[PDB]
Amino acid sequence: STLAENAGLNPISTVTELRNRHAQGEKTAGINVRKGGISNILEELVVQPLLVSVSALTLATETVRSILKIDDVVNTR
Amino acid sequence: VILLKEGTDSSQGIPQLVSNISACQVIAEAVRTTLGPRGMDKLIVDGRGKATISNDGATILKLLDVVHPAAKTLVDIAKSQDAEVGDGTTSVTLLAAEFLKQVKPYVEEGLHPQIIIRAFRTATQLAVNKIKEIAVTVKKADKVEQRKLLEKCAMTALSSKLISQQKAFFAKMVVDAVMMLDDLLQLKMIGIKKVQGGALEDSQLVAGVAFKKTFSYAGFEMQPKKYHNPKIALLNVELELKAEKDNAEIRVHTVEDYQAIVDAEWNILYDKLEKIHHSGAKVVSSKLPIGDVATQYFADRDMFCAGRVPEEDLKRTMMACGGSIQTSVNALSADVLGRCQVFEETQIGGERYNFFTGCPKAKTCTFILRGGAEQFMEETERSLHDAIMIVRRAIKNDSVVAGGGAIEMELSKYLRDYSRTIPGKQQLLIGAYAKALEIIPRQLCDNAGFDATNILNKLRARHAQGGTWYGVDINNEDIADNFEAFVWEPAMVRINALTAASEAACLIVSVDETIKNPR
């Protein structure tokens, strides 16, 4: 939704078209900012390794979990 | 001390025109979202506390009653539009304010108001000449029967609605209801009634006048409903036993006189009952309720009677049966009695319903609705009324143009390309006049939830390539040829809208001062 916004597209209709494309298709569907629209990501030469998305969810969840487990902050001296 | 105004309020110049321009936009904002069939509604409340909910630009402006005088001019222009056309009040008010919005910064830059009027009078005439050029007459297109094309028009207007699946059934009856009238067509002549419960297919197409028939008094197992040539009585008299209107309170000091007083009070009902039979009225249709005793009278005399009829259905029967309304019953004669070929009580939906058929003055009909709720029938009442207007206007005028803002973009193209070849101050003004036409398709997209930017930009490209009829599709979020989709509007209606819109903007633009006599 943020990529579609910066690419000059509708954030809702773009994300919506991808979910139907993903249920019917595969991961090839996505956003191509160079052309400004949905297209085959694998054909447009836009790819990243698996550790980026994996480490993102891992470190993000552990940080969100830590913020959730904090009940109060206490100062000392 | 010796002051010239002495409480007299008055201002003139550019601040007055800019002040009136902003007030004109406030009236458009109250009817900006009502543009289109799927437009948002407006709720209005009066001193009684009852709420009126409708997206009718004509009815909304009548209820606001704004005190600003520049707004009164726009509202008055809508009334002339109703008499001229009957619709297009939202387009005139919305489009007139758009001319004012675009010439607002030029007025502030010192451009004279009179120079602005010369552009509107010029661009309007050039637009009217282009409407008559692009307008096409459609009577026997490809030797297709007119009933076929008229159904495609009503189906498109009713598409994506509560009767979307059964739109074909409603399409046939709407065309058939219009075909049932005479040459002098009229929307007020046709009635639409609602019947709770049942499927959409069970909606009946009555040929004559009918009413809900809230009559629920005694007198059953009698009153033969069928009549071959009855005499229909149109009254507003109450024949109740102990009527709130008719009574006899005669105080006496004699037992024998009370027997006559109780009978005399009964005689008032009986004499009124006999005067109805004296003239030979087979069908008694009264506005006020009727008592159980009066039901037994005509039931024995082989005559029908049922009160609690609304005033509209009586007057709609007045034009149908060919008689007249008579509040009294003494002077009832053939001059007010009606006639029909078939009068029969029907039990559609379990409730009793009376209707006439084949009257001499049968210039009306009735549409019965069947649905699972009252709001499905209230929305369908006006949704079918739009299709009835579309079918009516196609019969009256065969010269039409593509709706959905298709002509507004061609005129925006022609006037913008014409303004380029006009040296002088009329260039920026005629171009501003062109850009103001794009508000009609822009709000049809906004009111429909679509992205007006993507459609109006894609639409402007198709018009530059040669598309003379492409416009906005309320159903699908895409550009479509409204001419091929049978979404048509008359060419004269669009002409009178621009004329009324330009005349309203010019009248506001020509104003410089507002004077107020203190009194």
Partner: protein
């Protein structure tokens, strides 16, 4: 005119303000959902006080000046005619759909697009209810199971202590006034009355009409078995006016003369009763001691001081006519009935006129008894929904398992079908699923359980354990699977709930501006 001080509210803030008005009415009523619903205290304008948990009664007495709330109240007039009991289900579902819509307006979706999705999801859910439904009296008309359904309905009311007896009379009443094959039961033919004293177990069915009026004299015959009833406006005596006679007797010369004329009218009309063949003579006014003394000698019972609308109902029920004067009497204008009895109540002198037909009738009245008027009042409405429960089963014996089982099953179908709609209505379909869960999630809350844990636990049970839907055990019974608990709601009711709820959400969504002029 009157533009100054004109109230106005427009824009997207108005839609959120309209939603805030509907949520206030839904949050008020979601607590009174289910049999364990929390009651509501009503403070009448005249100083009276009452307590009840009925959704329709709450909306009727709720004095709301907001215009959006008044529309939600108007839906009760259309819903109670079909369902009767769960008007709360429509208001709670409507307020739930509006709350979830507020999350979609922030996303930038138009209100009409939200309404288009709910209408699409409603047809998905309404189509799902037709599949998982089950019949009771398919192809045969029977009275055994039909009585059992109403017995669970009255259990939700204060009359639960005497719920078993009133169900049988409810089936005979509807079957009497109309046939199951006709599928046309009219509430106008059905009437309900009652009086303080006794208990609710003394509820009886009177095939005909009952009016709280006594005979002309206690010495009259207490049984008119023959079917000849006269219904006059004046009594069989010297004619009198409606207010006061004011006879002028100057001296004894006028007394002996007028008494002869008066006594002649006493004998003339009292003997006219047997001329026309009428045994019972019902009259709007009372009889004099001279008249009742002659009625006794002739064995002619008569009723006194009968009310205005009471005289109308006796003519309709007995099949007679409202005779204006004795001169218009005839064989056709005499009413019909099988037995007329005077029934007192213990030590009270009510002595209501009981007109029995001694056969199957077309109109039946329901007499209620109890130790409190307000419990009798709530007892009257307890049968009104039972009439709808019976009327709904007569229109269609197909039904769906209640207790929240239907709402949870439809939410799964609406959620799966949302994947097949590639358009902005998809978010509204998912919102329709979450809004459906508020009804069962509200039942568990009103009973004192964890809502979400009880909600999702029944979801996975509806997906993993078995395909038949399972409800919530809000009454703290053994377990789920409300089919065993015999808690089953009608199919037409659930369809009208989702329909009227989607309509009420559609009407509020397409409204985007309210205008009203203030006091100048």
């Amino acid at each position: 005119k009157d533009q100054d001080r004109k109230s106005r509210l427009m824009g997207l803030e108005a839609l959120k303000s309209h939603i805030m008005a509907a949520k206030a009415v839904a949050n008020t009523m979601r607590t009174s959902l289910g049999p364990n619903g929390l009651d509501k205290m009503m403070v009448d304008k005249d100083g009276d006080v009452t307590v009840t948990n009925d959704g329709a009664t709450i909306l009727s007495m709720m004095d709301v000046d907001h215009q959006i709330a008044k529309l939600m109240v108007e839906l009760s007039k259309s819903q109670d005619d079909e369902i009767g009991d769960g008007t709360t289900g429509v208001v709670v579902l409507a307020g739930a759909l509006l709350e979830e819509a507020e999350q979609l307006l922030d996303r930038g979706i138009h209100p009409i697009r939200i309404a288009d999705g709910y209408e699409q999801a409603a047809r998905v859910a309404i189509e799902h209810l037709d599949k998982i439904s089950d019949s009771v009296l398919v192809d045969i008309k029977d009275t055994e199971p039909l009585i059992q359904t109403a017995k669970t309905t009255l259990g939700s009311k204060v009359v639960n202590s005497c719920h078993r007896q009133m169900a049988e009379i409810a089936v005979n009443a509807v079957l009497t006034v109309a046939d199951m094959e006709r599928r046309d039961v009219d509430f106008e033919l059905i009437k309900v009355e009652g009086k303080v004293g006794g208990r609710l177990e003394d509820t009886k069915l009177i095939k005909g009409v009952i009016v709280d009026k006594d005979f002309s004299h206690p010495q009259m015959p207490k049984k008119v078995e023959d079917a000849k009833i006269a219904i006059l406006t004046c009594p069989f005596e010297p004619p009198k006016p409606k207010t006061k006679h004011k006879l002028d007797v100057t001296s004894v010369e006028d007394y002996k003369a007028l008494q002869k004329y008066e006594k002649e009218k006493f004998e003339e009309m009292i003997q006219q009763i047997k001329e026309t063949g009428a045994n019972l003579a019902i009259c709007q006014w009372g009889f004099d001691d001279e008249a009742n003394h002659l009625l006794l000698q002739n064995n002619l019972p008569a009723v006194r001081w009968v009310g205005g609308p009471e005289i109308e109902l006796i003519a309709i029920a007995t099949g007679g006519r409202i005779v204006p004067r004795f001169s218009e009497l005839t064989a056709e204008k005499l009413g019909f009935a099988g037995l007329v009895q005077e029934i007192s109540f213990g030590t009270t002198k009510d002595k209501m006129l009981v007109i029995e037909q001694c056969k199957n009738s077309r109109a039946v009245t329901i007499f209620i008894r109890g130790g409190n008027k307000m419990i009798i009042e709530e007892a009257k409405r307890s049968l009104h929904d039972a009439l709808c429960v019976i009327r709904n089963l007569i229109r269609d014996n197909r039904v769906v398992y209640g207790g929240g089982a239907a709402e949870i099953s439809c939410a799964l179908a609406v959620s799966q079908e949302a994947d097949k709609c590639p358009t902005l209505e998809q978010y509204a379909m998912r919102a329709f699923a979450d809004a459906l869960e508020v009804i069962p999630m509200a039942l568990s809350e009103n009973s004192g359980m964890n809502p979400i844990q009880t909600m999702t636990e029944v979801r996975a049970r509806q997906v993993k354990e078995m395909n038949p839907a399972l409800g919530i055990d809000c009454l703290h019974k053994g377990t789920n699977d409300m089919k065993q608990q015999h808690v089953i709601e009608t199919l037409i009711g659930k369809k009208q709930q989702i329909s009227l709820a989607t309509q009420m959400v559609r009407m509020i969504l397409k409204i985007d501006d309210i205008r009203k002029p203030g006091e100048s």
